[PDB]
Design a protein around this ligand. Structure first.
Ligand SMILES: *Cc1c(COP(=O)(O)O)cnc(C)c1O
Ligand SMILES: *Cc1c(COP(=O)(O)O)cnc(C)c1O
Ligand SMILES: N[C@@H](Cc1ccccc1)C(=O)O
Ligand SMILES: N[C@@H](Cc1ccccc1)C(=O)O
Lengths: 415, 415
């Protein structure tokens, strides 16, 4: 009654409960979606330059983006998407990719509108939809029929997907690479999704914050570069996952003027300006990355290789301890199947109809000194019972952390 | 139809049209609500320190605030308000005071709710209310019955104010010191407002971004320090107006847990984190200001004195050219009565039923080389006809700017 109905349901945040049980133990922390090593030197230094240069950089910049940043966004992303991107009509800088999503949802989703969300989903898609009056409509990526799995075998059933569309579908949220699965959507998969979007005339909010974290030669493709798609896609990105600087909380949306003009209204009636100096640091960091595009020494080349190594490392470590990893083609994350521990150990300390993975993650934190995130926080509530056997690890870590993890894992092994 | 109804009306932004007519002339810019000199050294250096210190500061901080910043906010503001402020239950760091307002409005205002807005009002109060489904209800500060006016003579008629309250009033937006008037609400005025708020059980969103810019010995008082008021006030502030660093876009809301828990839901479903390093810079800048509280050398002492000088300077300059200044007790701004020019010059190039002040500001920009902001952008549309004779100047400026202004003003004088 004091508060607005838009807040009904969405008030519960799984984060906080867990990342507070973590702090009351000696743990190797692998549930955190951020690096624990520094950003690359050229980007820190870019921040350093923007806070020590033209003093007017301490003041307000332009409402829809710091112009050097919208310039490099238009240019680099225009080239990657193969699109004529106008910085002033097609680019909006936002408070991280999170603020970008929020802006998008507030612009487009209204009482009645359905938003197709593909599980496992970054958890905020659902509450943001709900705050906007929409009705989430879920579809599940289903794993295919070795022993170690693969993210790319998680299938988007074409018939099941097509069935989700009604005349009330406003938007489909596509997240690639996917958090927490690490699926990198194929071209065929993208075409599938594009196909229905054109057909039913539906916007595709597409969260590509992990664009650059792709492994094993898999290729990040943007649904917006697909024929006819720009006119109906919003493409979100994040400086933080791009330059390993998550506390910079800069992101952007690219998309066509007839959509973006709504995003801009929300922006101008919510935050109005983004901080100036972060924008400057990000503009200079993209400049440095475009200069060196494809090159052995570009961050978008070395970083994925390094993190591919960390991934490979984690996969091996968790495997030999009973966990069944799903090799990701991208993102910061891999998930592991715990179905074996569920048989081995079915009753665990945990509240009433708490899904297994949640009860398991608590167990592990206490006894074995390791943080993961239960995957069920990324399923609609009705699907948590069926999808309660996965947990989510972050391998974007310092080597000292992989070391400490192995220490934890060997102490475990002796059981 | 593609976009959400919450965007109806609110899409028009007076800013942009004007600050683009400005850039196509040689102008002294006085419509900008930000300094054009640097922030104080200790605050720039605080930024410099947070972007070159513990590298983990490049990563995510806590959702509701960087803890060193919520610590100093609780402590300093607790002391100023005379209130026990818990950082975790009573403080939320937001994307500037703008993001704070937005958070507040999204938390509390719902279809039906009325929000009492006092004119002249910072323009966003109205559209934010509207996006939230609310119904702005207006009241006007009316100037009293010398020749030069005074902001403190603009009166909040007690009977007129009381009449605005219905059973549908959710919130009253109090802005003190006031943008664009520079009114510093008296204690009696505050008690008036408090009185009705307690009586009708209404929240008082109170925008105190100008807290420290008070002149002539006038005292900034917070409605929240008034008896019984904390339980029903939200107090917003901004690092940018506090430390002359508007592009830092850090702000906060203080208020009681039973209200703030809603602000937090909006926050966690909108931005989730604020950038880390700005927070660090602001925490250290408050630390430096509290250390030196009241002291000759504290920024909260010298800065108001300096800006009081700039104010005094502008008042004299604009006076002798026909403009009738209203001396502000606070804020960055003074407004001047142009009623004389309206008689002197009634027909001006400007669209159809454009209020006079808007047409006047355009005229001045072209011919006389000076930027102001028409005050009518801060009145409800039905009241613009009656309140079309004021324009708004920003005196928070470098001396080189006051110089150039005088140059413009003397070239003018020869007419
Ligand atoms: C981390 C993450 C975000 C948030 O990006 P920020 O720049 O931190 O706002 C958005 N989407 C996904 C899928 C993420 O993993
Ligand atoms: C400038 C201003 C704001 C905005 O504060 P930011 O920290 O820039 O968000 C809010 N309210 C008033 C009355 C202002 O003048
Ligand atoms: N996305 C990262 C971090 C994050 C958490 C909550 C909001 C935004 C980003 C994760 O899944 O751990
Ligand atoms: N508040 C200042 C600057 C500002 C403009 C628009 C949004 C937020 C802050 C002004 O009135 O000029």
């Amino acid at each position: 009654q004091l508060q607005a109905r838009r807040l009904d349901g969405i008030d519960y945040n799984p984060w906080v409960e867990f990342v507070k049980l973590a702090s009351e133990h000696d743990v190797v922390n692998l549930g955190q979606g951020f690096p624990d090593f520094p950003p690359p030197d050229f980007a820190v230094e870019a921040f350093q330059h923007a806070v020590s240069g033209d003093f007017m950089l301490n003041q307000y910049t332009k409402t829809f983006g710091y112009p050097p940043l919208t310039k490099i966004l238009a240019s680099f992303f225009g080239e990657l998407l193969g699109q004529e991107i106008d910085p002033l009509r097609n680019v909006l800088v936002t408070v991280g990719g999170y603020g970008a999503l929020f802006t998008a949802f507030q612009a487009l989703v209204d009482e009645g509108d359905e938003v197709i969300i593909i599980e496992p989903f970054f958890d905020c898609y659902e509450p943001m939809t709900m705050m906007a009056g929409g009705r989430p409509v879920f579809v599940s990526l289903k794993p295919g029929p070795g022993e170690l799995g693969s993210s790319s075998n998680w299938q988007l059933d074409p018939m099941e997907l097509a069935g989700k569309f009604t005349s009330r579908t406003k938007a489909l949220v596509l997240n690639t690479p996917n958090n927490p699965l690490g699926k990198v959507f194929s071209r065929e998969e993208l075409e599938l999704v594009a196909s229905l979007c054109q057909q039913h005339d539906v916007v595709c909010i597409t969260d590509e914050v992990y664009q650059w974290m792709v492994y094993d030669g898999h290729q990040h493709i943007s649904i917006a570069s697909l024929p006819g798609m720009w006119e109906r896609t919003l493409t979100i990105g994040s400086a933080g996952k791009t330059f390993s600087a998550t506390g910079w909380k800069v992101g952007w949306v690219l998309g066509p003027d007839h959509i973006m003009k709504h995003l801009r209204t929300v922006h101008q009636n919510s935050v109005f300006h983004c901080p100036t100096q972060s924008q400057a640091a990000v503009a200079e960091s993209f400049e440095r990355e475009q200069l060196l595009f494809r090159q052995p020494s570009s961050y978008f080349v070395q970083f994925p290789q390094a993190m591919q190594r960390c991934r490979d490392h984690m996969i091996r470590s968790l495997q030999s301890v009973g966990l069944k990893p799903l090799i990701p083609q991208g993102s910061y994350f891999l998930i592991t199947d715990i179905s074996d521990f569920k048989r081995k150990m079915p009753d665990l300390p945990g509240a009433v109809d708490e899904p297994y993975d949640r009860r398991f993650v608590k167990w592990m934190i206490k006894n074995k000194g390791l943080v993961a995130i239960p995957v069920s926080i990324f399923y609609s509530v009705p699907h948590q019972k069926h999808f309660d056997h996965y947990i989510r690890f972050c391998f974007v870590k310092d080597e000292a952390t992989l070391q400490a993890m192995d220490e934890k894992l060997r102490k475990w092994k002796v059981e």
